[PDB]
């Protein structure tokens, strides 16, 4: 009941955590490729 509400909230947050981790991932990867292109040339 309240338990259901608490569960939904936590699951919403875990979806967000995943999203933020992928965003982090895309940024670090873009920087990697930038240093790779700069390192190669």
């Amino acid at each position: 009941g309240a338990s259901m509400d608490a569960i939904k909230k936590k699951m919403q947050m875990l979806k967000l955590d995943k999203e933020n981790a992928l965003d982090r991932a895309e940024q670090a990867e873009a920087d990697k490729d930038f240093y790779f292109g700069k390192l190669r040339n």
Partner: protein
């Protein structure tokens, strides 16, 4: 197949003791019934026909369904707040009659001839057996219902346990 109702009445002529009325019928009282009166020593039995019931309703100018309703209330211990019935039996003539009592006056609701049976002890024993069988059946019903309560309680508990464990696990990831 059939049903019965055993109920307590007081006769006008014997106010100090309880008599028992035992009424049995097939589907509805309207289609006829067997009525037995007993004082716990003798028994008197009569049979009322569908035709006899209709004739009475007609003679009293009462709508059929209403009259049958009155028989149910009087004979099957179903009187409402405004329903006051008095019961009469002569053990000489074996004439049974009952009246509904209103503000200042009364009216006759039914009349039966109830013959003294030759097997009173057997009738009394069968009546007690029925009470004992009814009690066994009701006790079983009570046990079945109690276990239904316990099953639904546990089903409820299980759902809440699932929610609590889920939240716990979610809080750990």
């Amino acid at each position: 197949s059939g049903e019965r109702k055993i109920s307590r009445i007081h006769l006008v002529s014997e106010p100090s003791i309880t008599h028992f009325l035992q009424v049995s019928w097939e589907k509805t009282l309207e289609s006829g019934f067997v009525i037995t009166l007993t004082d716990g020593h003798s028994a008197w039995t009569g049979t009322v026909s569908e035709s006899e019931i209709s004739q009475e309703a007609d003679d009293m100018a009462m709508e059929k369904g209403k009259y049958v309703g009155e028989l149910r209330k009087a004979l099957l211990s179903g009187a409402g707040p405004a329903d006051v019935y008095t019961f009469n039996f002569s053990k000489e003539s074996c004439y049974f009659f009952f009246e509904k009592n209103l503000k200042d006056v009364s009216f006759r609701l039914g009349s039966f001839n109830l013959e003294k049976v030759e097997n009173p002890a057997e009738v009394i024993r069968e009546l007690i057996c029925y009470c004992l069988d009814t009690t066994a059946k009701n006790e079983k019903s009570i046990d079945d219902l109690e276990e239904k309560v316990a099953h639904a309680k546990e089903e409820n508990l299980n759902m809440h346990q699932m929610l609590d464990q889920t939240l716990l696990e979610l809080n750990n990831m």
